[PDB]
Design a protein around this ligand. Sequence first.
Ligand SMILES: C[C@@]1(c2nc3cccc(C(N)=O)c3[nH]2)CCCN1
Ligand SMILES: [Zn+2]
Length: 199
Amino acid sequence: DKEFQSVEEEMQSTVREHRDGGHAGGIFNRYNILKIQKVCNKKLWERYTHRRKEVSEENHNHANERMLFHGSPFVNAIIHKGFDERHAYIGGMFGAGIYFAENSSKSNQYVYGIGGGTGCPVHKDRSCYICHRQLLFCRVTLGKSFLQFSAMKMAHSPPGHHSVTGRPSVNGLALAEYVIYRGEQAYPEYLITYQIMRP
Ligand SMILES: C[C@@]1(c2nc3cccc(C(N)=O)c3[nH]2)CCCN1
Ligand SMILES: [Zn+2]
């Protein structure tokens, strides 16, 4: 389908060269996309659309929805139970939120844990070209997004806002990131199974 070619194109075209020289996510310029599955979870979709309507009403009739990537070792729990802010902690750059990227390669750095953890379960390699990885391509409601450049450890969205946008700066994020503080503000629409490819 054209729908899945659109997802593959977003995955491939948003890859960037990372500052860590590939330490966290591995060394690659492209992926080998193995499978793209649309997630159809009615209960999660209804939780998402209900919140999206509330946010839209609080943001001049505009949800400010974006399709963004999410990398996590807990993708299977997310598809079944949804995103859950109770699993987020204050330590992150923008505090206790759920983080998303517009660059697939940035989310890929989080698939095996913080900073890529110890890499794949079988070879303990953050740059494994063999093991199949999974990323989510999500529908995210940003609403009135608070624009921020430096670390700001929050527990919740800033007053009057529905999310935080981390914007690139000098010392300094390299790439954007988007943070929500309510799990119902995102829907895990596509599950992408892939490998990073050796350059
Ligand atoms: C390190 C962490 C993180 N930062 C991100 C920025 C953009 C995307 C993601 C993602 N999961 O795809 C990120 N995850 C996890 C919790 C504290 N912040
Ligand atoms: Zn491996």
